[PDB]
Amino acid sequence: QFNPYGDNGGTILGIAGEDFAVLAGDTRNITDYSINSRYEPKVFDCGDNIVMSANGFAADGDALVKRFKNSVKWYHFDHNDKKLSINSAARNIQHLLYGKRFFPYYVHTII
Amino acid sequence: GTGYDLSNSVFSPDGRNFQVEYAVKAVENGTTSIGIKCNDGVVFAVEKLITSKLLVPQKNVKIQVVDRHIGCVYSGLIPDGRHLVNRGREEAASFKKLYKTPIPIPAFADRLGQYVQAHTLYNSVRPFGVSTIFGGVDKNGAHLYMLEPSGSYWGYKGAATGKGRQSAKAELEKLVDHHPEGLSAREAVKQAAKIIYLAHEDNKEKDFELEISWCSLSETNGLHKFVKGDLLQEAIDFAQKEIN
């Protein structure tokens, strides 16, 4: 039977400094015991000084990032180019995620 | 009484549908365009009036392609012309999806015909303000067509419509009479450039830009392509030379 999920592995780490913050993640992407790519970026710059990573099932991680980036884009269009504070981006991502409460994005996301 | 000309699907006492007749008036008011069926393809040409110097030359293309083998040109309300092509494109996609083979020109013709005719059945829509000359090459030959706002259409040896439709038709008839065996793809292209120049007299106030396209089994492999560069300039001269 078709299983809509998979696990591409990888790992991501985030630490916040007093006037800075870091978000890292290995670049290895896999499937079972094989390696799909030794270099497949997993942490992104989404604008407004926000970095984001949705690790777990790559296809889901990609869709989420993509959607959030598009979120920022329309935030500007609809609110006079206002900058999306990080706490606002967080609440927005919650709705993006909960929106699929019954068919979850199989990812642990960090920003 | 009267008022028969105020609603679209209404029959007048003489069995006419005035609103469709009024759409024609909008077509006769537009630029002139033509189609010349040749021995193994068809050629399309149109007059593109240059409103001013500010128009970017060669940038406001009017001739349209349907699928990969059909060409469409039209006179009248341009937006309506597009709407009709958009539909033509879907109609073609649908036919190819189910039957595999690309849509035969005759078949494509009727698809447009029924859609246009449909817009003369209800008073909640307006008839199309365009006449359309289209055609291409298929399983068996080349086909040229012209579709009126009434939804009426027929196959033609040559066809024209627009402001200078009569000048054009005069020229076309001569061609038919003076070339009984058939015209060639190469020939029809030039000839077309000439008819356009001649028919431009009925609008000789504004300067114009020429546009040709063709579909020939031997010359374009049965695919619709626009005439550009050398072949285009060659036809421009052939005309500019015969207009004097």
């Binding site: - | 105020l6 609603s7 008073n123 909640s124």
Partner: protein, 244 residues
């Protein structure tokens, strides 16, 4: 568009009246008159068949009095066809009530529902109202014998005696003159016949031009009975009351 032909059946007049309802009432006022007289031990329904012929079959007939429930019946004034549409939905409402509560539908609830349906055609939908006025005669264990009336407007009211259709102004006056609270069914059966007999637009008031019904509680039982008089029964009672 179509807006051109929309009569706008549900709009107000500068005076605040509903055109169609008013005109529908005007229509009713030409239909065979129908009387409703409520006694202490029963109810009477009398109606005059508008237009008749020797060949008109009166035995297999029913154009004014209809049985809704086992305890409710109505007298119709207006478009018979419209009436049936309403009657049928009223017969359904009665059963849904019974299936839901295992009790017969109280007279007013059935009347209000039907009136609400009429009211609807008065405020939305752009359809013409029903050219019908009803006299409801029924019984329930809360108010006993009841008599109601409903017209095209969707408005309804209760009465001791009432009439709908033609000559109601004359009819209401006569009833209001000889009616008395203590009356007995048979007294009403005569008041009903006398009144029609004086307002009829016909020569004589023969049996073949009438429909009669009573809702009595035949003492020798303890339940309620609906009697729809047969031609012969009307001919008799028409002679007893001294109208021969």
């Amino acid at each position: 568009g179509s807006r051109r032909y929309d009569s706008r059946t549900t709009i107000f007049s500068p005076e605040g009246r509903l055109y169609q309802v008013e005109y529908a009432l005007e229509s009713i006022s030409h239909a065979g008159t129908a009387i409703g007289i409520m006694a202490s031990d029963g109810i009477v329904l009398a109606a005059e068949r508008k237009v008749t012929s020797t060949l008109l079959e009166q035995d297999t007939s029913t154009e004014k009095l209809y049985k809704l429930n086992d305890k409710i019946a109505v007298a119709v004034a207006g478009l018979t066809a419209d009436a049936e549409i309403l009657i049928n939905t009223a017969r359904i409402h009665a059963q849904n009530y019974l299936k839901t509560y295992n009790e017969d539908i109280p007279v007013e609830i059935l009347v209000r529902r039907l009136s609400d349906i009429k009211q609807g055609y008065t405020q939305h939908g752009g359809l013409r109202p029903f050219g019908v006025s009803f006299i409801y005669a029924g019984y329930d264990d809360r108010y006993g014998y009841q008599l109601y009336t409903s017209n095209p407007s969707g408005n309804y009211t209760g009465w001791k005696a009432i009439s709908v259709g033609a000559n109601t102004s004359a009819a209401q006056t006569l009833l209001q003159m000889d009616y008395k609270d203590d009356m007995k069914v048979d007294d009403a059966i005569e008041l009903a016949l006398k009144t029609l007999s004086k307002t009829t637009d016909s020569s004589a008031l023969t049996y073949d031009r009438l429909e009669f019904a009573t809702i009595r509680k035949g003492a020798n039982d303890g339940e309620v009975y609906q009697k729809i008089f047969k031609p012969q029964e009307i001919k008799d009672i028409l002679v007893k009351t001294g109208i021969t």
